[PDB]
Amino acid sequence: GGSSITYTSDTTGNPRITNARTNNDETHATGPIEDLNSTSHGREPEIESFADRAELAMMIQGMTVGALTVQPMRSIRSTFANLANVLIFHDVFTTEDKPSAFIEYHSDEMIVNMPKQTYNPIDNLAKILYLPSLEKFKYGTGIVQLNYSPHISKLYQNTNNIINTITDGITYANRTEFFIRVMVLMMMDRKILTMEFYDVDTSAISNTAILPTIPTTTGVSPLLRIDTRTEPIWYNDAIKTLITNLTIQYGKIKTVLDANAVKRYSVVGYPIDQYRAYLYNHNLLEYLGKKVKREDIMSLIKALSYEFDLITISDLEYQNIPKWFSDNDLSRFIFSICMFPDIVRQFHALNIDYFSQANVFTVKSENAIVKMLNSNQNMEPTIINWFLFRICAIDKTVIDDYFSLEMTPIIMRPKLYDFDMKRGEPVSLLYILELILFSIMFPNVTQHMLGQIQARILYISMYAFRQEYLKFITKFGFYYKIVNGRKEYIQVTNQNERMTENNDVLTGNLYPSLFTDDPTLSAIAPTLAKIARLMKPTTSLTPDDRAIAAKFPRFKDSAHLNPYSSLNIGGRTQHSVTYTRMYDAIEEMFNLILRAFASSFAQRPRAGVTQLKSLLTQLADPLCLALDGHVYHLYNVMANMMQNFIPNTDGQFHSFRACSYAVKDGGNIYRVVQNGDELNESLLIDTAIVWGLLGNTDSSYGNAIGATGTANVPTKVQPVIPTPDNFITPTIHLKTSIDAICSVEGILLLILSRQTTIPGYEDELNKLRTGISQPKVTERQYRRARESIKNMLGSGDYNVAPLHFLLHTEHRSTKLSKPLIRRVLDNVVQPYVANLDPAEFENTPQLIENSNMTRLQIALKMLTGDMDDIVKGLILHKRAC
């Protein structure tokens, strides 16, 4: 079906964020001071100072009699502004004034004509205070009884809307449905109560039950009826003798200003259904107690930035602002990415946004590599026609996709698109060199394509090296299997099908040959040790603490492979090692192809080969310049972003063993990396991109220093890398999206598949579940349930983890009873083991935030109490009683 995931809601904790490049005023912090320690007010003016000007400028003169006035003066305060910007943090919920309770009294009387009411007050105080209650529990009632307010009788349906069952009338199903909808109501919709008071003195006499400060909007209660003289004096006597022990009040009791954030609130004694009261109290007293350690903000704002920057922030400690942290962050992340694969598409999209924002590469026309080599016609005419058929056109929107594909977590093993190779002639060595370059430029993506590259390079060798080839096969045939620490080699003793590429080569105890040293590899078949040694990355391994200090999610002792080095070491601008690497690569390879010519075809000319050797080197110099001089920093930043948390390599092409966590769901198992024959054209990659790039690239770096500009040089403007703005908002947008969908799935798990949810009650949850009619639910019911709920939490759409293929997609089943996270060695789910797994999982991940768990607890312990309108059994009899 659909392929984009756009779902959101306002139930999570994550805040909302906006920006402003504003520095000429404040116009963003407004409010009244409530205490000499208040930290969130507007701005007050300051002492009116004067000039106090004395520059430091090489023989300035005296100017003595003017200055030193009796009004205070200022300091120097030089002027540069040092890139100032403003972030604005918004939370979600709002206020309202009338109580609007859940349960309310309602009455009815038994006499059709009753004695008249005898209450003529004089002072309007008695009126405002207890006329309505005195009206409710009037003389001559017959029963005053509890009942649901409106909006709840409204939430009762009554017909069926969520459980597609063919039923006869009304039975347990409307009850279940009603429970679900009132529950999902209370889980949402935070509110905090704001009231208004009076100025009552002592007019309310002899009633200790009434404090001197009343809320305007009255309430109904016997406590307000007691004082006057009405229906049986008996009744007042009884109420009073009953309550004379309890602690009842009315109106404002006291006031305390919280210390976690100084804002006066007020505890008041209004009468209201206890559940609404608890909801108000809880969801308020949560709003005031959210701390955020100051340097965490700093670590964040610095993680999303260039690494060589001084960043300063407002300097009080423990700002109150909705934190994006969690105890279970990585848990929900892997649980999501493993069951919503479109989220990786969202990741990737955001990542290409960040990258293309810096326009590192613009494209010129008329690729030079084909301009030359066309008009000199003094070389072998296959170099033609072959380079002539490989160079495809290029529009950056593919460049900036291939480059971004470097970091985002790969989830489907990729295969290469095109493969041209002449069988006998020594030209294929060009294709060998092409993929060598493509490996030395993106060491990450190679880490997976290793399987295909094995068979391809081996084929090509077989037609261009024979002794080395077959000897190599004889000894180091085709596959490592690590038995117990040793490495046994298994072969293929048949030319039935050697050039296969589908043998899950990177997961499971089966490694490809060619790569791990066993130093006897060299000195057995040279040029193959020579190939392999040329491809291993051998750059570095950097930690990424910068992220881990921002409470972003990822495992412990995580790293990356920044494929390139730097240029500025103390200010020297050294020789850009990557260029030396690529250069000796090209030079060695051309030495090899030349020796190839000198073997089979000597009657042919060999000037063009060295000619374009010089051409290739001279053309690769400034490219690698721009690569190691501008992209390096970009990859550091991207490596500290939030999307990327699955590292793609340890470097060495020895036992990598790509990540293997996976969610088991009662028999069915969903993997993270999804071995097996599966992909989508978004991930089938080409190689010729390197030729086209190296040829017709206009790097914003070169023409910056005037190295590859047109008709002019330089521009002297420094290469821009994006600003910490423009990414806070999308990043938080993304995190809140996945938190919302996980919240939906969790609420769904709550009321299906009995044996998963057991927080602290296990009894009224059982009462609720009565209505699903079976301790197993059919799929279509599940699907329709999730759609009906998802259209009631937020907005948008999302999918249920289909699996792609080159042409068709399939919609795997979605049940999810008691999900568990476990690691899968050799496609056999391991049991949990401490000290190897992060020891965090240990059990099903708690998909719901704590607060909402409390609110659901409240919903339960409310509507499973005495308001259950169900009872059993009755007796037919005929009696005139």
């Binding site: 404040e26 963003h28 912090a29 001071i33 205490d35 000499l36 320690n37 208040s38 930290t39 969130s40 007010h41 507007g42 701005r43 007050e44 003016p45 300051e46 002492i47 009116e48 100072s49 003595t64 009699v65 003017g66 200055a67 030193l68 006035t69 009796v70 009004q71 205070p72 003066m73 200022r74 300091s75 120097i76 305060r77 305390v256 200003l257 210390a259 100084v262 300063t312 922030i313 407002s314 300097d315 009080l316 700002q319």
Partner: protein, 192 residues
Amino acid sequence: AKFDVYETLTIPTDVKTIVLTMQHISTQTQNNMVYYVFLIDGVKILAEDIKNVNFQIDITGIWPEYVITLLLRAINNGFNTYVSMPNILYKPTITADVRQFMNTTKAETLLISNKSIVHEIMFFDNALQPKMSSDTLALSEAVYRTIWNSSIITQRISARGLMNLEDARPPEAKISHQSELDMGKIDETSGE
């Protein structure tokens, strides 16, 4: 910062207290120019190398014009100086409202007067200074003050502050004195 009012500035002890007489003002030369210097301990001192002195000036009326500029430069362009004058008469106006703490009088005219010219001075107060907003980066601005009261200046103050910092008496607020709330009986003869 935090200009108290009830506090009077006390001169620290490790400062030589030099009475100002018309003998300490002499001249010297350097590079063929005749500048004005001090004679505090026999050594000629330029008006900016003053380290720790407290100038007691009394008549505040007769000092020709030089020592005026010298004194002013040394209150500026100096490390730790003090110019007291315990004979200036001034009407103080004490207020705490930043929007009207306007007070304009160049210390020159304060110093060159006729020994009885009693004139006005304003006085701010911010001892109960509420915390600044939760945005201000870092107060990196100097607000050097100047002339300090030298005696008790608060006899007409009835109450300061009236805030509460964490729902408790701020450490430096002032309620009224029990004197100006008492109400004794009358004397039935002639009131009083």
